[PDB]
Amino acid sequence: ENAAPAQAPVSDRAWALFRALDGKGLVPDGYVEGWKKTFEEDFSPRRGAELVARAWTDPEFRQLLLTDGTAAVAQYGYLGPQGEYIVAVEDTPTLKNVIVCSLCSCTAWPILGLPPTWYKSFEYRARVVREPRKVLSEMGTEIASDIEIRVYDTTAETRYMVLPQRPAGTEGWSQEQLQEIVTKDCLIGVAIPQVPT
Amino acid sequence: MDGVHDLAGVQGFGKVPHTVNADIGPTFHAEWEHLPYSLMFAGVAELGAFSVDEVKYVVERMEPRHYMMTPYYERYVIGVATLMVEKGILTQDELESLAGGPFPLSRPSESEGRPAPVETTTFEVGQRVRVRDEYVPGHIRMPAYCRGRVGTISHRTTEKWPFPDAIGHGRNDAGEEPTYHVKFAAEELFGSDTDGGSVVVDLFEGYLEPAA
Ligand SMILES: [Cl-]
Ligand SMILES: [Fe+3]
Ligand SMILES: [Mg+2]
């Protein structure tokens, strides 16, 4: 009762799927290796951090990113699969934004990177929509009971990034300095950018 | 589909396995894990054998206990394999032969899907909308926590896309619709049993109606 079906090792099953398709000439040469490279090297939260640091230092770009994210992202050349229609959402002193895909894992891949394991967990997918304050708290981010939390559930084609607030103690930093404190978690919305002492 | 994958709001789960900026390891934690996505893209863009929506649905169609014990990337191996067999590109026998053992797939679909609704409305920012009180046994991009609930339009997309409840079944009548960022108050969705403020769901036009 309730017991798992017998299965071959997952690596064996994944390689079998590959070999069945590849042996029929259905997979171009280099095709999966190409995608692995794109996933590991091109799609990256460093891009989203670049965008944030630009927005922080260039009021005109910040405005473009917030009204037409897709256009803003296109200027850097960072549109791509699972990131063709982009909306950036702006934290303020009374609003903290957080992104999930409750139904699966949907994420703005090209500018956030592929989602990490935790984001795809049943725990995140179930809980953040109903108790985001507690979830963030458990993750190490306190949001005062005053600040509205707004969860974006990624249920269609819009692909989101959070524009976090710029923290105090960064005045006059270079775009490279600011990029360095905008992490993947800041773009997802679970972390606030941290300035060292 | 009111499947176990529709997790938002379920209670009983423990801690999310992360604290901020902790090490998440490499993009792929095992040497096969780039395969499900890469092979999905071969299916969608090279073979033309299915849509992305069909991938989402075939993962929804995993036997529920099977879904619940299966790591994420494995679900998409199983899903893509299932679609290859369903569309007549591969057989289960050849998959199990190559794998050296059992390769159970997602369950067959119990719905043929539905077309893009004929009657819909173009909503404006600031307008009040209710999520249609409808039950769809096939693919739908509406998590159940919002069914029947009221919110306000924050955004109408400037592009349009095939209606998932059609294209996710490989139908020829998916049409195209914009989607809407619909903002719900937390208390609209979960009563007093929430600590949040608002939730924004990105909802296809054909899931919405004007709010009384
Ligand atoms: Cl309507
Ligand atoms: Fe998803
Ligand atoms: Mg349900």
UniProtKB/Swiss-Prot annotation, chain A:
The keyword Ribosomal protein does not apply. Fe(3+) binds at residues 101, 104-106. The keyword Ribosomal protein does not apply. The modification Cysteine sulfenic acid (-SOH) is found at residue 106. Inactivated by nitrosylation of the iron center in the dark and activated by photo-induced nitric oxide (NO) release. Inactivated by oxidation of Cys-106 to a sulfenic acid. It holds the Pfam family NHase_alpha. GO terms for molecular function: nitrile hydratase activity; transition metal ion binding. Its EC number is 4.2.1.84. Binds 1 Fe(3+) ion per subunit. It comes from the Bacteria. InterPro entries: CN_Hdrase_a/SCN_Hdrase_g_sf, CN_Hdrtase_a/SCN_Hdrlase_g, CN_Hdrtase_asu/SCN_Hdrlase_gsu, Nitrile_hydratase_asu. It catalyses: an aliphatic primary amide = an aliphatic nitrile + H2O. Its cofactor is Fe(3+). Transmembrane segments: none annotated. Oxidation on Cys-104 is essential for the activity. Oxidation on Cys-106 stabilizes the Fe-NO ligand coordinated in the inactive form. Belongs to the nitrile hydratase subunit alpha family. Heterodimer of an alpha and a beta chain. NHase catalyzes the hydration of various nitrile compounds to the corresponding amides. Industrial production of acrylamide is now being developed using some of the enzymes of this class. This is Nitrile hydratase subunit alpha. The lineage of its organism: Bacteria, Bacillati, Actinomycetota, Actinomycetes, Mycobacteriales.
Curated annotation (Swiss-Prot), chain B:
Changing residue 40 to V: In strain: ACV2. It comes from the Bacteria. Keywords: Lyase. InterPro entries: CN_hydtase_beta-like_N, CN_hydtase_beta_C, CN_hydtase_beta_dom_C, Elect_transpt_acc-like_dom_sf, Nitrile_hydratase_bsu. Industrial production of acrylamide is now being developed using some of these enzymes. GO terms for molecular function: nitrile hydratase activity; transition metal ion binding. The keyword Lyase applies. Transmembrane segments: none annotated. Its EC number is 4.2.1.84. It catalyses: an aliphatic primary amide = an aliphatic nitrile + H2O. NCBIfam families: nitrile_beta (TIGR03888). Heterodimer of an alpha and a beta chain. NHase catalyzes the hydration of various nitrile compounds to the corresponding amides. Belongs to the nitrile hydratase subunit beta family. This is Nitrile hydratase subunit beta. It comes from Rhodococcus erythropolis. The gene is nthB.
